[PDB]
């Protein structure tokens, strides 16, 4: 993250900024991660250094949680619980030193953590241990505003540890599923049917052609994102066991309600029936 204060004061709206696959070539970073509140973790200069870290983390987490609730228009629902889960997870990887963003102020935080837990070859074990001891309280802190200010989120699911790439694929899948129907709706509004007895509208109608171009650009980003994320999953998996999850697709099948692998690959490769009907002249 290249900012420190602002992202602890407000969040950009959902899918306002798409996943970023260009900053670091072998991963795509979600806007939520870029904006993760880490103000206190950044600006901080033994058993007590750990204690001070705990206080700072508790406070950054409570603010992050509050801002995620606000981002969701104060709705206490699944979208909120998932966001809490994703951000909690990212805090965990930051603490454990296995976060994949590593941009700007995230580097400062990592330096601070190395200053705290040290850098020897058993430091990583200590960081993981400290996280496992603290994670339940960090989750609880993220739920502060919901408890205190607001007028169904499950700890156990939230604090269960899995690699960041797994979690990011879950979050990505849920974004994709939300975006698809919207993008299709925009297409149908302009491209449904024919312009004459024989030719689809996309053959001649500029607004439809523009619409197909916009869809093309969107689906091309989705394809690129799946490509990058799914391959990061494989490389991470090869270099590291999770029961029930063998392929990146298994994550989507388990996270999403109605996933179908063949249909999904059809969609992101522009060979699904609906896209062809609407956007392919012949």
């Amino acid at each position: 993250s290249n900012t420190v204060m602002k992202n602890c004061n407000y969040k950009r709206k959902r899918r306002e900024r798409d996943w970023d696959c260009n900053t670091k070539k072998d991963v795509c970073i979600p806007d939520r991660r870029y904006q993760l509140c880490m103000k206190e973790l950044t600006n901080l200069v033994i058993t007590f250094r750990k204690l001070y870290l705990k206080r700072k983390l508790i406070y950054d987490a409570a603010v992050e949680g509050d801002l995620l609730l606000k981002l969701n228009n104060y709705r206490y629902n699944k979208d909120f619980c998932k966001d809490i889960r994703w951000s909690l997870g990212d805090f965990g990887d930051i603490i454990m030193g296995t976060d994949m963003e590593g941009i700007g102020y995230s580097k400062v935080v990592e330096n601070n953590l190395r200053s705290i837990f040290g850098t020897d070859e058993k430091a990583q074990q200590r960081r993981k241990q400290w996280w496992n001891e603290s994670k339940a309280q960090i989750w609880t802190a993220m739920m502060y505003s919901v408890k205190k200010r607001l007028k169904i989120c499950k700890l156990n699911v939230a604090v269960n540890i899995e690699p960041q790439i797994y979690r990011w694929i879950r979050e990505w899948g849920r974004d994709y599923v939300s975006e698809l129907p919207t993008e299709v709706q925009k297409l149908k509004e302009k491209c449904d049917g024919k312009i004459n007895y024989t030719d689809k509208k996309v053959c001649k109608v500029p607004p439809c052609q523009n619409a197909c171009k916009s869809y093309d650009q969107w689906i091309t980003r989705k394809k690129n994102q799946w490509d990058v994320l799914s391959n990061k999953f494989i490389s991470v998996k090869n270099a590291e066991q999770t029961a029930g999850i063998v392929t990146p697709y298994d994550i989507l099948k388990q996270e999403l309600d109605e996933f179908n692998e063949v249909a999904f690959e059809n969609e992101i490769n522009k060979r699904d029936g609906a896209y062809i009907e609407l956007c392919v002249c012949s």
């Binding site: 206080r55 406070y59 409570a62 603010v63 802190a141 502060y144 205190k148």
Partner: peptide
């Protein structure tokens, strides 16, 4: 705008 003390004591 969150009160640290209240947050700290609420988190346990």
């Amino acid at each position: 705008q969150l009160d640290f003390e209240d947050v700290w004591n609420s988190s346990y």
